[PDB]
Amino acid sequence: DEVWVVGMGIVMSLIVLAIVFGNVLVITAIAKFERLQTVTNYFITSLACADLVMGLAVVPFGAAHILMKMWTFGNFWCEFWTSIDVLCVTASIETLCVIAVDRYFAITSPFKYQSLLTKNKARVIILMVWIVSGLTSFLPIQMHWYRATHQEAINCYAEETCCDFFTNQAYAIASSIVSFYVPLVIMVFVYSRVFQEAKRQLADLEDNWETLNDNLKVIEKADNAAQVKDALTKMRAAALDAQKASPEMKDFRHGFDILVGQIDDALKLANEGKVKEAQAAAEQLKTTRNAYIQKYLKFCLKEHKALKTLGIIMGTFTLCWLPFFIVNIVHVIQDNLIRKEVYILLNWIGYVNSGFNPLIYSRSPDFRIAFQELL
Ligand SMILES: COc1ccc(C[C@@H](C)NC[C@H](O)c2ccc(O)c(NC=O)c2)cc1
């Protein structure tokens, strides 16, 4: 029947269109607009470039191998399509793990990360990633280093109208390890460490502010100057500790600078012996802390939003690529337990992650405001 053709042609066309549109949207406004040229954006644009080339190359030409019968482009073009597929997949996963490592270095030891790498270092990392993926993909294919030991694969290597993908045990295992498993382990450990540090930051911040509120409350009904002085000393210590623990961080530190200044004025007034003026400055401190939790409601919201992030990134990447890289190994060993159509389906579930990546890595306020003017 014609159901197999028309039912699944439209979804493939829509997938290609979504992939190309998202990738050209992400690539644009990174190099054009200011405030969007950062070291992390250098990895993001490489990921977008890999997704774009994969969406133009292997999705349309690969779908051509589907629906209709066989290959009508050429054996050299078959090798080129296979090589570019492996290159794009490997480059995308390596770029994902590089972005993970970038976030880890940003969160862990932020002072060193403030200036340790520049555009030159990020570009060097990008070229290293891309050349590693190319060595993994192009080199073992176009001169037939994967080969096979099957009688229904020899009738395809020396026959034009066929583009199956039969590889040796060593090549399949090495490609799975380089492309997916090493990045999987690296990014799992990286994002687990990033999760813990973020939890601990929000935790210390919320503690500090509890003792700030308690000290302010005890000042509100304090009797003598000694109680006000002691409570203001504890408030100053906790405020400095919270200050010690992006323009958002700049505003955060500026607000804590204002709070520390007001606390210092209150403490000096209390030290001089004027309890009433100390209580008035404490009322001003109450105004400041009330002004705080409008901003922290927003920022605690953004933080639990990127904590869901860990979930969204990990779940999407794993659910998209892990089934394919498990079936790939369990297919080269005990080959008769694996069916071809489910192999193609699991590979296309990996393919469709190309259109998902822009919708996972562009959910920032700067990217959101930049995307509007292009539309
Ligand atoms: C019906 O037979 C076929 C024919 C072609 C394919 C697409 C394949 C070239 N894409 C391979 C996939 O895209 C990929 C990506 C990254 C990798 O590291 C490896 N490794 C394989 O050993 C494989 C699939 C099944």
Side-chain angles (χ1 to χ4, degrees):
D1 47 352
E2 208 184 1
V3 180
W4 303 101
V5 185
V6 293
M8 89 185 163
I10 301 179
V11 296
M12 293 180 183
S13 299
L14 193 143
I15 280 171
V16 177
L17 189 151
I19 285 174
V20 298
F21 178 52
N23 290 318
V24 301
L25 202 43
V26 175
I27 288 189
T28 307
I30 287 178
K32 311 270 193 93
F33 291 167
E34 207 59 34
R35 192 174 38 92
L36 262 60
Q37 303 144 30
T38 56
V39 285
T40 312
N41 271 348
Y42 281 21
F43 313 128
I44 285 170
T45 182
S46 179
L47 172 60
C49 275
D51 291 331
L52 198 156
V53 59
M54 182 179 72
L56 279 72
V58 305
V59 194
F61 287 80
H65 191 64
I66 298 169
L67 283 72
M68 61 79 71
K69 202 204 197 153
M70 283 174 319
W71 204 251
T72 57
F73 287 71
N75 225 337
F76 197 80
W77 292 121
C78 195
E79 297 181 354
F80 203 52
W81 164 64
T82 287
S83 296
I84 194 67
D85 186 8
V86 186
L87 166 72
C88 295
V89 171
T90 311
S92 308
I93 309 167
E94 311 295 30
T95 317
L96 290 180
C97 73
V98 165
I99 294 180
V101 169
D102 188 14
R103 274 201 51 140
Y104 179 60
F105 274 30
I107 304 300
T108 316
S109 86
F111 291 165
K112 283 194 279 262
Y113 180 77
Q114 206 277 330
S115 193
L116 183 82
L117 74 164
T118 316
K119 328 291 173 191
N120 193 11
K121 273 313 175 180
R123 186 54 56 185
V124 163
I125 297 171
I126 294 294
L127 321 183
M128 191 45 178
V129 165
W130 265 94
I131 200 53
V132 160
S133 46
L135 288 174
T136 300
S137 63
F138 293 101
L139 269 295
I141 296 175
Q142 293 180 356
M143 71 205 97
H144 320 90
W145 280 18
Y146 53 90
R147 295 179 178 92
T149 46
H150 302 156
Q151 291 83 16
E152 72 295 330
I154 300 169
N155 264 307
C156 185
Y157 298 141
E159 190 276 331
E160 150 66 23
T161 46
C162 167
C163 274
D164 57 28
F165 192 53
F166 290 102
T167 56
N168 224 337
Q169 300 264 57
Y171 177 83
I173 282 161
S175 165
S176 296
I177 287 172
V178 171
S179 305
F180 185 67
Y181 292 130
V182 168
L184 182 53
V185 170
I186 283 167
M187 182 179 72
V188 167
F189 284 99
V190 160
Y191 264 84
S192 197
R193 280 158 186 258
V194 166
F195 175 68
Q196 300 310 323
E197 313 306 341
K199 163 187 179 185
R200 185 190 57 194
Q201 311 321 74
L202 233 286
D204 73 43
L205 184 49
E206 324 159 41
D207 292 20
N208 287 351
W209 264 106
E210 279 295 327
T211 188
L212 292 193
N213 286 279
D214 303 328
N215 293 288
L216 202 52
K217 292 172 61 43
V218 65
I219 297 169
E220 194 148 34
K221 64 193 71 43
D223 291 332
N224 314 337
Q227 300 142 59
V228 189
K229 194 253 180 203
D230 294 358
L232 281 166
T233 308
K234 317 201 193 313
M235 202 178 315
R236 180 186 209 268
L240 283 157
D241 294 0
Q243 172 191 19
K244 291 177 70 68
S246 84
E248 289 85 2
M249 271 305 138
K250 280 195 208 153
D251 291 354
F252 184 76
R253 286 194 301 276
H254 290 355
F256 273 108
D257 291 331
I258 300 301
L259 168 69
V260 164
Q262 300 200 9
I263 278 164
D264 291 331
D265 311 342
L267 179 56
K268 180 66 179 67
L269 275 176
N271 269 322
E272 213 174 0
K274 302 167 177 63
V275 59
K276 292 300 193 310
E277 320 206 3
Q279 298 184 344
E283 286 271 330
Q284 302 308 313
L285 288 172
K286 172 185 322 159
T287 300
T288 59
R289 64 161 201 71
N290 279 12
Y292 184 21
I293 52 170
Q294 308 292 321
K295 200 76 186 310
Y296 159 103
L297 280 216
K298 294 168 27 183
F299 143 113
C300 225
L301 178 159
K302 89 159 180 54
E303 212 52 73
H304 303 320
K305 173 269 303 176
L307 198 175
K308 170 175 55 176
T309 264
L310 154 85
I312 63 172
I313 292 175
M314 281 315 288
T316 306
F317 168 71
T318 313
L319 184 60
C320 285
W321 274 122
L322 182 64
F324 169 56
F325 278 103
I326 302 295
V327 69
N328 204 27
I329 291 175
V330 70
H331 180 214
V332 289
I333 62 170
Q334 323 204 340
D335 54 76
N336 63 7
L337 281 72
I338 301 299
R339 198 170 65 189
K340 189 209 66 172
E341 311 95 299
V342 75
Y343 192 100
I344 303 162
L345 166 61
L346 294 191
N347 194 310
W348 273 79
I349 305 175
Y351 282 154
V352 298
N353 183 269
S354 179
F356 293 157
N357 285 341
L359 311 183
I360 304 167
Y361 280 101
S362 75
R363 294 163 86 244
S364 87
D366 297 330
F367 290 166
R368 284 211 291 310
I369 62 175
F371 271 34
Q372 288 176 353
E373 61 86 20
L374 306 173
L375 192 147

